[PDB]
Design a protein around this nucleic acid. Structure first.
Length: 49
DNA sequence: ACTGGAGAAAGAAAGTGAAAGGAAGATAAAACGGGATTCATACACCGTTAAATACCGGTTTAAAAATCCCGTGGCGCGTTTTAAAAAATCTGTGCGGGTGATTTTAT
């Protein structure tokens, strides 16, 4: 599926679901800055499949 | 005395070997984060019941919804900039026969 990410400054980004890290129940995850060109204080606040 | 060639002195410009140092790299120790076990222990599922809550009938009333006039700033259009992505153009490289060349040790 496609994913539309809305940031805190009105920006929009597109990304496939299977490009996200896959982990287990006890893991933590990976920072999202490595996947999208965000700024120093820009956060994702909405997702639309 | 005078002339013109030649050798030697003297002076100025260019090449040189050595120079801190600093950004630019490079290499180890450390702190970190993600799997295999091991249970005791707290959590999931099953019968019982007092109690707390949902629901119906009829008011009401104060609050929110609806309506009209108007005056603006927030979108819309047309025309420029400006990064960003794409297409086009150069740069190396190795295959196998040919031409010609380099270096270090012992006695």
């Amino acid at each position: 599926d496609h994913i539309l990410c809305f940031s805190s400054r009105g920006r929009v980004y597109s990304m496939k679901v299977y490009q996200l890290p896959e982990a287990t129940r006890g893991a933590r995850g990976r920072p999202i800055v490595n996947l999208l060109p965000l700024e120093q204080d820009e956060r994702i606040t909405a997702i639309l499949p």
